[PDB]
Sequence to fold (1172 residues):
Amino acid sequence: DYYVGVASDVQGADAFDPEEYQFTCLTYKESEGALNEHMTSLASVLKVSHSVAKLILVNFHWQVSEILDRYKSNSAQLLVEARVQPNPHCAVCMQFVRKENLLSLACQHQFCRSCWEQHCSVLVKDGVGVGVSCMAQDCPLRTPEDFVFPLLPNEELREKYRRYLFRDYVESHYQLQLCPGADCPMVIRVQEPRARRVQCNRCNEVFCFKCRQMYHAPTDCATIRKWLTKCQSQQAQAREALKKYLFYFERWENHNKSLQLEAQTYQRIHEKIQERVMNNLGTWIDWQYLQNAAKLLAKCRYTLQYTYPYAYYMESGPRKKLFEYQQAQLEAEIENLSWKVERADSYDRGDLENQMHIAEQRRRTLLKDF
Amino acid sequence: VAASSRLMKELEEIRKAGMKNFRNIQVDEANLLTWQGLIVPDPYDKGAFRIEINFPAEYPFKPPKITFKTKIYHPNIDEKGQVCLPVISAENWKPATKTDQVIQSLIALVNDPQPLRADLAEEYSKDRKKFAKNAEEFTKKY
Amino acid sequence: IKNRLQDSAMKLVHAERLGSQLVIGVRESYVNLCKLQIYRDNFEKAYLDSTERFYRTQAPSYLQQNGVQNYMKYADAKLKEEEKRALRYLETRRECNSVEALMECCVNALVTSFKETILAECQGMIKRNETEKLHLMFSLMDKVPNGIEPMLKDLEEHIISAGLADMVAAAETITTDSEKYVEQLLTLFNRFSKLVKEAFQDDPRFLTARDKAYKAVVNDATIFKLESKCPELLANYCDMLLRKTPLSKKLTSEEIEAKLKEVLLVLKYVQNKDVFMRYHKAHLTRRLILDISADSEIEENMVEWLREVGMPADYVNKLARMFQDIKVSEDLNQAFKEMHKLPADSVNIKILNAGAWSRSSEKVFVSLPTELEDLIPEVEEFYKKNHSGRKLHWHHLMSNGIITFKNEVGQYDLEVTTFQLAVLFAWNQRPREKISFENLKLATELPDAELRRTLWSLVAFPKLKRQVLLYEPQVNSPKDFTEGTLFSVNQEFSLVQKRGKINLIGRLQLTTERMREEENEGIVQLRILRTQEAIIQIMKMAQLQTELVEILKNMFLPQKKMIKEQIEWLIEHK
Amino acid sequence: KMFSLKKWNAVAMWSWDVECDTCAICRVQVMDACLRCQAENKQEDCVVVWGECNHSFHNCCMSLWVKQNNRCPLCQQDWVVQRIGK
Ligand SMILES: [Zn+2]
Ligand SMILES: [Zn+2]
Ligand SMILES: [Zn+2]
Ligand SMILES: [Zn+2]
Ligand SMILES: [Zn+2]
Ligand SMILES: [Zn+2]
Ligand SMILES: [Zn+2]
Fold:
């Protein structure tokens, strides 16, 4: 009777992870189902043929609301912008053909069947799926897929075309993405699009959702691209530029090389724990905090590694001074913790726990903006 | 497959016309897949040049590559022959343009420059001499 | 004897083995004949080959005859005999590894070639406490390289399965209680530790396996149809041990310390350690203010023990801050009481940090009596006399006191909180009348939920015999309270003694739901309208406040500052 | 009178009377101790400093700041102390 309502008598300021992002892994069959559902929804709300619906969808990144309001605004300009309707004896192979063998698009440019059959095959062999368009110059009217299937001769092709269409459809969809790993039939789905950390559940590949490159937490996707590409009075300018590039690159490369001694220190810590266990100075459960400390140290080093490119581009001001001060403090704490965990013979559980709490707080301080 | 009829028709058409902007051209002794050109624009006013036309198979369905043999001074032309032609490009290509239109566009682009050599583009930001004197010197040198 | 009589010597050794200076002499002859290549190439090779042939021909027969039952004993005896014979015969005076080679051959011929058959029974032998045979099996298998991994795997699986099955088997009782849960955990831990000690002589690898298996068992959440119930139960047990309860009454200090040490040992394997120190903090917060601690030094040492076992520092630091604030507040209260010379010896004050303790400056609205209203400025000035830059927030959910109740039968003493006190002072000016729900809401300035909870507390106390207040419409839960319910003060309350003291505070709440200012604004506005109507009527018709109290005996009791500002408004508007 | 009062106990919470309630250097609550002082297990000694620019920081953190640079972290005015805690 005294201990009845205890579970509801006990915060949102620091509890939340400032690097949390919810996603879900999808296979090809489920992607097919999702795309088909969207197709049969839009092609009914906005009654058209299914292929026309797909061409409209790819142009606007598969956003139902925007398409559906632009339709009520002006359906005519909606269709025109999707490159379906034109904006308001064969010129390819100069010959004469019976009218029964003439096929034309909505733009009404007339060419015979043989060149239509060969053009699509040649462009498919190149590796394009949506780039097919009309032959005559200066008309961007793309061809729906139901106008491309009957032209393709064989069954070896007609399956590469579907793969290309699937790839382009997934690329254009704002909620889906493809795993950058080699030969991975996996698709990532997120309710909202943002630049965060995404991990595959099959090949365990870590990448950013938008740029598909390596995860870059406190740095814009385009900012790191030019850094990766890079990596008299004008003489002084060049000397100073090289000097500051070296001043940042020394720490960048320190951490880059350090991200292999992660596993190497894991090995030494395993050795030390095994030694202290085999000398009967305790049990296994009494020495497990060193591994957690090592993981925390590696995480902090990664975070610090991906801040120097971001600090290289700040405009001089109080924010730069504060960021540098906090960076120095976190570096000092990192060195102190590493010295206590790696090159010490004794150990105090309370002291190491307090140091771990301080180090975690110091790391969390830097991400106050992101 | 259809990489022949268009070729013979185009050769007959260009032979019948006999334009003055383009002086003469040879079939390179029954090659049927490539030949060599000779343009004559009317800066680069004086001088007859040589252009190597590259016609892949299914010529109407593929972009004909363009290159220059004799080195000439132009912002849009690379060191030896690598010149990018928007009409015959990879993206802005249509299987309906014929060789006459593309050679006319080439003559136009030779007639006046477009603001690959980024250094010559930077010169072209404020170019009068660096396009009217050195270019004349090279053209009359070659 | 380069090659002659070597066969005879080997035959003699074989006959002895089946069932003495010549062999030693021949071995010395090889040793000293010619640095010792001849001894390594011959004789030694013949000895090893004869041993291998004899055992490769003999062992399966005895295996088939005596089962897996007698094979381990036979093997141990054979290795002991071979080791003794090898020391007796083979050379050992020149630092040679012949005995090591023979021992390796024997191990490879008697144990390695049957490891699957030996290990097939390990799963069944661990259960039903076959420790005597398990020790022999472990001793034999420790020689072969990496041959004890299946033993560890079987121990892991047995511990996990047995723990889950035993905890499921008694689940209709364990979940509700806490002491039974802790006793079950300790029973399993002790049984498994005793098994390991008796069967494997405290080998570190088996200790590691037991630790992993126990960690798997403790953190399982199959019970409760799955959450986070284990830390709550552990905190409840610690509270029962550390509070003035009958369990703590019938025990001494040493037993309490032993129980706390056992709880810490069990808790060392808990994964989600961020919930235990959030429940323990609340229990300690409740205990340090009601002053219901059985012992203080045990509580002081508990925080150090918790720091040692591996708790996060973010809560241990707060606990230490709490313990220091208790002493600081005691000194401050003594100083205030000495300086202040409602009697001054019946008032206590506590000033506590806002970080370690509850951290929320959310306004809570309640009507206070005259004494408590006048006490606040004195305390505020006393605090501001010394400290600079500090501001005080008064916490009405954690204040308490004792009041006197005069009835027809007699008088008693009641232990109440602020809300109960405010509710009870509604009948001071109308002792024999009845008050409805709406008038109680207006008079006490309380929201709906808090008023309902306080009314339930004062009308239906769990173990009480005769209640203090009375309701007209019957109900079975506080949720079904209407605005037509009338409340009256009982006039036959007792406990039939004519004096005593009872407690109405059980597990005082520390947090409440969020407050909305719209209802408070409306109640206050109605207060201004009612007070202005009453004062205007009295003017139309020193002792002014007395007659205000006399006439406003059915709505509420007006306050001094409200009356002053209202009369200022009146004289402003004539 | 009925329902008199006999004995009372009062509980109050104290906190610093500041604005923006953050040290702006360690980004922790001003009402809690700084990292170093809670690491050294010494309490009741972290006072809060105010400046002429109405900036309220810890004394420990701002002393470590002014050991290198004599300016406010959040502005550029020449830092000078106006009021100190406790
Ligand atoms: Zn055609
Ligand atoms: Zn067209
Ligand atoms: Zn993948
Ligand atoms: Zn990115
Ligand atoms: Zn600070
Ligand atoms: Zn401090
Ligand atoms: Zn400032």
Q: What stands out?
A: The longest strand of chain B covers residues 34-37. Chain B is about 30% helix and 10% strand. The two ends of chain B are 41 Å apart (CA to CA). Chain B has one domain: 5-141.
